[PDB]
Structure 1
Amino acid sequence: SNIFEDVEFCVMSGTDSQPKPDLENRIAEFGGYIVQNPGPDTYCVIAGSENIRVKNIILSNKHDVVKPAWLLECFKTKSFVPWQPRFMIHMCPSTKEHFAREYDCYGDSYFIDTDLNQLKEVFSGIKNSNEQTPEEMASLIADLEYRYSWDCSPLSMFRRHTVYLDSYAVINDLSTKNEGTRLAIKALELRFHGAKVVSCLAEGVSHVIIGEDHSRVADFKAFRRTFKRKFKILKESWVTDSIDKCELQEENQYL
């Protein structure tokens, strides 16, 4: 049971459920040289904690740091498992060049498929960035949804249907908010379901929803005449039926 053959390892792990002595004894009984400090001959240093020594090693680009999990997996399978950015904390320039070929800059590969857990691991490394703006992200999402026959999602079923609600007594006035009970929550649900709700009636509006107040129908019918594109007036049964059936209903039956 000697998988290893004349290989030098340095261990500096601190706070861990598998302290240093057990790993050192295991390495010794696995035919593996153990050293207390790194050197030109050692080909890996293991440390499960971000102490000062690992930071110093990181700042000196001459060695590779590997998490303890790599050696545990090696023990489990009784075979030499190839390294991976998953089992790594830092890479020397040679390992950076090697992994830059078949492993992308993040922790993903383009030669082997991936599963849910692997993709979650890749996403964990990625950090939030704010180089985007709402409208452009929405447009890019729409293009992505259109590209790969990707319009079949139930929660993105209103991506391309912007809806304007008649919850304001005076159009284009934010100070005339009403106290609609059903209308307000219905608009909130529409927004939550992927639809786009705009408080200001602009040229980008596509659909219009009017509650049980029919007095405003004439105003909307007059406004749509000047608009280059005419929107459609629909009743509340349309949205409820669409949500219940999980699929869009024809507006002809609800115009």
Structure 2
Amino acid sequence: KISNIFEDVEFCVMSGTDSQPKPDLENRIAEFGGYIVQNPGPDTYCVIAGSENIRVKNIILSNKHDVVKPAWLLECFKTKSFVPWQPRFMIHMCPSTKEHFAREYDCYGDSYFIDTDLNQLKEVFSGIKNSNEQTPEEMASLIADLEYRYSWDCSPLSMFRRHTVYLDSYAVINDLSTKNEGTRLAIKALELRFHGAKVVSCLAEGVSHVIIGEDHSRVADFKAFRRTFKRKFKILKESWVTDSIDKCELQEENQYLI
């Protein structure tokens, strides 16, 4: 009666026991005129699903209809009108509805004509499984280019994406066993690790920002490998790394020399 758009169209609320009792779902479709059925029939537009029982899984196993969470119904209940389906209140695709999530959505909840907000992005990203199957060089090459091509290399806490520093935590350089204990020299590496910085503990081609900590007499050892590698590293104070991310920035070598 009220939302008579649901009327003249049959809906199968067969499980419908996630949190809403069936009679309430059966009642609400009545003041909206929608037709209720207790079996999957071809005249049913979609199946209003609830808990995940064996037979609704069989309905999911079958391709007879569309498996719908009550959230879409509640969205339809509150709006008193049909709501286009999204991969957040919808379960299973029928061949007619298979293209529906392919027409205005690509492969996830992301759409092609509805701008995504933070809530949409979080739901879309949550739908995507979490797995970092990518080597750290590739974050520096392609993923760092996301902050480059789209100009995000100035982000406060992640700006060492393309800056590769020296984890200056050794009394003698070129030796990785004389780790300095009791000091906060490891903060530079973690701050480098806070971004896409390739944390190379030894003087290598990657080392370009020597962050001198509590010992500056080690510059002589830096001179040995300052010529053996192309991108020469420069003597930089703790402000370039230790205080830069504390200030949430990325300092420059010239202003942080020594």
Contact 2:10 2:45 in 1 (8 A): yes
Q: Deviations over 1:94-147 (max 9, x none)?
A: 211243222212122111212111111111211123432222133222111110
Give me the TM-score of the superposition, normalised by structure 1: 0.88
Which of 141, 153, 156 is matched with 1:154 structurally?
156
Distance change (3 Å), C-alpha of 1:62 and 1:9: same
Which of 37, 40, 57 is matched with 1:38 structurally?
40
1:56 alignment partner in structure 2: 58
- Residues 155-234 of structure 1 correspond to what in structure 2 (within 5 A)? 155-192=157-194, 195-234=197-236
Gaps of 5+ in 1: none
Q: Which moved more, 1:221-230 or 1:60-69?
A: 221-230
Distance change (3 Å), C-alpha of 1:181 and 1:37: same
SS at match of 1:242: coil
Distance change (3 Å), C-alpha of 1:49 and 1:217: same
Q: Deviations over 1:51-83 (max 9, x none)?
A: 112210111112111111222222212222233
Gaps of 5+ in 2: none
Give, in angstroms, the shift of residue 170 of structure 1. 4.7
Q: Which moved more, 1:43-52 or 1:161-170?
A: 161-170
Give, in angstroms, the shift of residue 153 of structure 1. 0.9
Give me the TM-score of the superposition, normalised by structure 2: 0.87
Structure number having the greater helix percentage:
1
Report the number of matched residues: 255
Give, in angstroms, the shift of residue 203 of structure 1. 1.6
Distance change (3 Å), C-alpha of 1:193 and 1:182: same
Q: Deviations over 1:40-61 (max 9, x none)?
A: 1111111122111221011111
SS at match of 2:244: helix
2:240 alignment partner in structure 1: 238
Give, in angstroms, the shift of residue 238 of structure 1. 4.2
Q: Which moved more, 1:244-253 or 1:48-57?
A: 244-253
Contact 1:62 1:93 in 2 (8 A): no
Q: Which moved more, 1:66-75 or 1:169-178?
A: 169-178
Give, in angstroms, the shift of residue 204 of structure 1. 1.7
SS at match of 1:34: strand
Q: Deviations over 1:191-240 (max 9, x none)?
A: 33554421232222111123333332212123213333321011224445
Give, in angstroms, the shift of residue 15 of structure 1. 4.1
Q: CA RMSD in A?
A: 2.4
Q: Which moved more, 1:69-78 or 1:191-200?
A: 191-200
Q: Deviations over 1:164-203 (max 9, x none)?
A: 1332245444433221413233443443355442123222
